[PDB]
Symmetry: C2
Subunit: 190 residues, 2 copies
């Protein structure tokens, strides 16, 4: 009865990074700025279907380090992921779409981003809904000396969100959505 829908990406924009001003420089790793957090209410759209859902994020970029950080948008440990731009990494946080759900640091091979209880209780799902969404947070990290100037950051897939459900027919679809870092130009100066 219910229509399937192509899962929709959730994306965050490099263009929102402030100008990176390297002050007096040699501390590595360090966060050099946060992107403006984004959200997508309708990553997965179940149509007329009403079911208990949860989302599991798996990062797909190479891990190159770890850093402790407290996003402005207690601290957590974050895995640093390789952007393909030398000297530059990123750290990732994700949360449920609605407020009152916590920012989940990406520091494991996979993690449930909503409900976070599913990480310790395999039977935990959200209340029945017709859709599943999320919030996305990213910060840029200097892993070493940075290229100065107007540096092109490529669009990168950060990972996938897998939709799971207590209902077998929905769980077995293994619906997945890409989590994207939209590329752009950053400005780096001393």
């Amino acid at each position: 009865g219910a229509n399937d829908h192509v899962p929709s990406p959730i994306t965050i924009n490099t263009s929102t990074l402030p100008v990176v001003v390297i002050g007096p420089a040699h501390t590595y790793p360090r966060v050099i700025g946060e992107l403006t957090g984004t959200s997508n209410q309708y990553i997965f759209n179940g149509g007329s279907l009403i079911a208990l859902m949860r989302g599991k994020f798996t990062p797909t970029l190479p891990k190159i380090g770890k850093i402790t950080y407290n996003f402005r948008q207690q601290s957590s440990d974050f895995d640093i992921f390789d952007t393909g731009v030398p000297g530059l990494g990123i750290i990732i946080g994700m949360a449920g779409y609605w407020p009152a759900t916590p920012l989940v640091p990406i520091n494991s091979s996979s993690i449930y981003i909503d409900p976070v209880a599913a990480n310790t209780n395999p039977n935990a799902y959200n209340g029945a809904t017709g859709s599943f969404g999320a919030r996305l947070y990213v910060a840029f990290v200097a892993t070493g000396r940075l290229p100065n100037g107007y540096v092109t950051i490529p669009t990168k897939q950060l990972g996938h969100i897998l939709l799971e459900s207590n209902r077998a027919s929905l769980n077995n679809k293994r619906l997945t959505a890409p989590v994207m870092l939209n590329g752009g130009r950053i400005q780096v100066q001393s």
Copy 2:
């Protein structure tokens, strides 16, 4: 320095199924193909940007498997196909996929996962296509009566048939595990019995 791109779906339309007229010759024969959808294609399922790399695509169906049928797609020999449950009782579908370019064969979907291009990868795990900047495919679907059919004006919901996984000899690309959905666009099908009349004089 190449940009990643959101994988694009490859889709096929329920609306292209002809009207299903059940004739007495195969009315009670199950399973049987009741019609083919118009085949579709997408050259740019995966878009590597400026990257040039050796690629291949592995399809995994995600609908329930409910049977097997031997069939020769009209679009030289028959093949065995797994029948997948559409969620509409009595109606299943079979799937074939191929490389985007001609000269690559139709690959029947009859395994948990299968390489659709190059088909050589099903017998040689080190086989990839020639280097390209993109990967695409062709999609074929037929509807199957698995039992007594619902007659009338029947709604077929949009269904995801499975995923295509992009693999590569280049580790950085292979580890992205880029996946694209393979979609059956829903629609309404018409199912009726062959006409008949009686004498009135």
